[PDB]
């Protein structure tokens, strides 16, 4: 069983920053790549960020590029997403995703999904 704890999600002002922390248990964190997926209520799932075994950044969603930073620590078994220039479009539910393929180039599927935390961006 893999459990993906979710935290650091709360109501925030638009011109502010917020860090999201994912806790990984029940599997080796370094062995499996970790991804961020957000889904605003009443809207389809939207991939946000991806990272791998070597902690190299696979990429960011074009809409969040240059405003979102992804980082993970293999020793702490935790991955952190730093969000800046938050907007109403940014407001969504961010679920941790566990990826079986480290390269995530092909045939990569999410074995487990985190419960998620609700980021709200409003004045």
């Amino acid at each position: 069983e893999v459990q993906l704890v979710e935290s650091g999600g709360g109501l925030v002002q638009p011109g502010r920053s917020l860090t999201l922390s994912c806790g990984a248990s029940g599997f080796t964190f370094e062995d499996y790549a970790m991804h961020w997926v957000r889904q605003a209520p009443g809207k389809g799932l939207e991939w946000v960020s991806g990272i791998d075994w070597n902690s190299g950044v696979i990429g960011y969603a074009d809409s969040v590029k240059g405003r979102f930073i992804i980082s993970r620590d293999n020793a702490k078994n935790s991955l952190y997403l730093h969000m800046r220039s938050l907007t109403a479009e940014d407001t969504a539910l961010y679920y941790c995703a566990k990826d079986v393929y480290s390269e995530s180039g092909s045939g990569s599927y999410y074995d487990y999904w985190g419960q998620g935390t609700l980021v709200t961006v409003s004045s």
Binding site: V37, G44, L45, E46, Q115
Partner: protein, 110 residues
């Protein structure tokens, strides 16, 4: 930016086969097999199909479907009450270098 296309909602009587279609550009669906996710409303998404037809442990054999060309088809047989959920097809795009997620299809029983 290519977007995976899915029908908005599908409704079928219990015991009626359900077909869900995912439409993608050749670079995304053609290169890597689509992955289907069954998400019950108010719950975190659960992987339904890995690498197209292959099913992860804990997924019913009645769930099926075949991807031909750029289209991925999910086939549901022996439909029952409480199987209602939103289905998302996800295939990473080599050309876009980003994961692509389908809009989703709202399966339900009256």
């Amino acid at each position: 930016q290519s977007v995976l296309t899915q029908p908005p909602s599908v409704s079928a009587a219990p015991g009626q086969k359900v077909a869900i279609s995912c439409s993608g550009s050749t670079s995304n669906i053609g290169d890597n097999f689509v992955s289907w996710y069954q998400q019950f409303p108010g719950t975190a998404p659960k992987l339904l199909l890995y690498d197209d037809a292959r099913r992860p442990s804990g997924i019913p054999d009645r769930f099926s479907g075949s991807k031909s060309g750029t289209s991925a088809t999910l086939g549901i047989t022996g439909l029952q009450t409480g199987d209602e959920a939103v289905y998302f097809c996800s295939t990473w795009d080599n050309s876009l270098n980003v994961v692509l997620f389908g809009g989703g299809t709202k399966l339900t029983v009256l």
